[PDB]
C-alpha cells in the first residue's frame, strides 16, 4: 500500500529451476560443491563425535565439545548447500 522497505543488498531469490541460484547461500555463494560436501561430512563427523563425548552431561562439561556439537545441525545446512552448488555447476 506504501513501498515496503528491505535492507540494501536485497536481491531476487525466487526460483523455479532444479536448484536455487547460488545467491541464496549468502557469503557462501562462491564456495564449491566439493568444499561444502567435504565440510558437510567433516561437520557431521566432528559434530557427532563432540556430541557423543558429552551425552552423559555433567556439571563440568568440556566447552569445546559443547561448541563442537553444534556442527551436527550445521552439517545439514552444509549438504543442502553442497546439493545446490553441484546443481549450479560449482
Amino acid at each position: 500500500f506504501s513501498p515496503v522497505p528491505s535492507p540494501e543488498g536485497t536481491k531476487e531469490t525466487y526460483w523455479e529451476t532444479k536448484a536455487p541460484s547460488s545467491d541464496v547461500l549468502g557469503i557462501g555463494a562462491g564456495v564449491s560443491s566439493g568444499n561444502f560436501a567435504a565440510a558437510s561430512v567433516f561437520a557431521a563427523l566432528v559434530g557427532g563425535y563432540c556430541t557423543g563425548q558429552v551425552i552423559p552431561l555433567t556439571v563440568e562439561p568440556n566447552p569445546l565439545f559443547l561448541a563442537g556439537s553444534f556442527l551436527l545441525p550445521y552439517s545439514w545446512a552444509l549438504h543442502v548447500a553442497a546439493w545446490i552448488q553441484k546443481n549450479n555447476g560449482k
Binding site: S32, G34, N35, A38
Partner: protein, 180 residues
Amino acid sequence: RAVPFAPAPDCLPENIPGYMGFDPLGLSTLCNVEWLREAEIKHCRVAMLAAAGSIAQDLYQFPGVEKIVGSAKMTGVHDKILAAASTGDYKAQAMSQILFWTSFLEIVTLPAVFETMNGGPRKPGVFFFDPLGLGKGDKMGEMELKEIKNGRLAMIGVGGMVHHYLLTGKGPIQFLSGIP
C-alpha cells in the same frame, strides 16, 4: 587383459599409469574413476610408508623409545603409546602429532581431489612434489608405474605383516627369519 574370463569395463581408460586390464568385478563402473585412481595412489603411498616403517621399526629404533615402548612390535607400539598418552604423559604424544599433521595436510590438500574430478588441470595423485627434480628433469612415466607397483605390493605386504603379527608376536624380521 588380466583376466581373459572377465575383462575390464570400458569405463576404465587404458591410458592411466598401472592399467593392466584388471577389473573383473567391474568396480570402476560403481564409482568415479578419478576418485578411484586418487584413492589407490593415496592407499599405495600410505602403505609404502607403513611397510618400510614396519621393517625399519625392527632393524633400528630411534633413541630412548625402549622406556616408552619396550619391546612391542608394529601393531603393539601404536596401542602402547596411546595407552601411555591416556594418562597425561608428555613423552608419548607421537600418535597425536602424526594424526594432527596428516589431518592438516589432508585438510589443506582437500580441494585438489575435487578439482581433478571437476575437470581441473592436475592429474590424480600429482602434488608436483619433486624437490630433487630427479623424476622431472629426466623423462617421467616409468617412475609412475614403479610407484604404483611398489604401492600395490606395499598394501599386500602391510596386510601380511599385520595379520602375521595378529597371529604370532613376531614382527617382520622375526617372522621372516624362522618358520613356525
